[PDB]
């Protein structure tokens, strides 16, 4: 459950991301593909080379979804409804992979926000990513 302090922390950190969201999304994906090779099995149709426009394009979509989730933090299930349908019935990504991407998103945020990534914000962001992950897999079965 996200407490009001958690919401403030998430809104503050994401606000600093601002216009760089898409670039951070792509970097997070790159970190994931390199660190956890098995995640590449869901993108056999992509060029996963560093600099790939496909990865850059996808990172931007992932980041925009997160931006939408932050804006509707008090109403995530409905805001992400189409996305949970998509992952549950079409993409069918095994649930463990959401933990792998979440970690990589955290690492990306840490490497770019030295001043804002305090222990408290780290905890709030991890709680936030776990909630997003939960909503995205809520219709799996």
């Amino acid at each position: 459950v996200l407490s009001p302090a958690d919401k403030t922390n998430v809104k503050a950190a994401w606000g600093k991301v601002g216009a760089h969201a898409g670039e951070y999304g792509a970097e997070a994906l790159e970190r994931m593909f390199l660190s956890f090779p098995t995640t590449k099995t869901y993108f056999p149709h992509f060029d996963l080379s560093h600099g790939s426009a496909q990865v850059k394009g996808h990172g931007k979509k992932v980041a925009d979804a997160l931006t939408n989730a932050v804006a509707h933090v008090d109403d995530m299930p409905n805001a992400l409804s189409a996305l949970s349908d998509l992952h549950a019935h079409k993409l069918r990504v095994d649930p463990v992979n959401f933990k792998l991407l979440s970690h990589c998103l955290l690492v990306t945020l840490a490497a770019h926000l030295p001043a804002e990534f305090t222990p408290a914000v780290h905890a709030s962001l991890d709680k936030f990513l776990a909630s997003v992950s939960t909503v995205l897999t809520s219709k799996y079965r």
Binding site: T41, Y42, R92, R141
Partner: protein, 146 residues
């Protein structure tokens, strides 16, 4: 994997009573029913709309016996699972694009099927032996992923 002589004999003894084709279809079908996202690789198998459709599907049954047959042959090479599954590992990674988590799920579903099939004979120690084997096979199949 490191199985004690008693663990190896428990696995072997129990396996000799297994109808490989029956259990293979049963395990794969339950994998698809209990963890429906694993159905992603099988859209060409046809109707998988309901549990009865999955369980009665001839293509699901055929893939199950093929998968369990390779599993079965692997039990004769418990001391060299990585070498025995090396080519299958590469195939599953490079051509099939199967997330190795699926192997872990199949392994647990298989342990549940053996328990349902053998009842009281599937004792806690026998289950422990099978958990090690099923984890070993899943590790062997994911070894060549890159």
């Amino acid at each position: 994997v490191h199985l004690t002589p008693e663990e190896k004999s428990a696995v072997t003894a129990l396996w000799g009573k297994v109808n490989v084709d029956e259990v293979g279809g049963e395990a794969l079908g339950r994998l698809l029913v209990v963890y429906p996202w694993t159905q992603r690789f099988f859209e060409s198998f046809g109707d998988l709309s309901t549990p009865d459709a999955v369980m009665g599907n001839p293509k699901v049954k055929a893939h199950g016996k093929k998968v369990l047959g390779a599993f079965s042959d692997g039990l004769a090479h418990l001391d060299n699972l990585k070498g025995t599954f090396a080519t299958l590992s590469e195939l599953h990674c490079d051509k099939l694009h199967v997330d190795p988590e699926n192997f872990r799920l199949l392994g647990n579903v298989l342990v549940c099927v053996l328990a349902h099939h053998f009842g009281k004979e599937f004792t806690p120690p026998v289950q422990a032996a099978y958990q090690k084997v099923v984890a070993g096979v899943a590790n062997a199949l994911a070894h060549k992923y890159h």
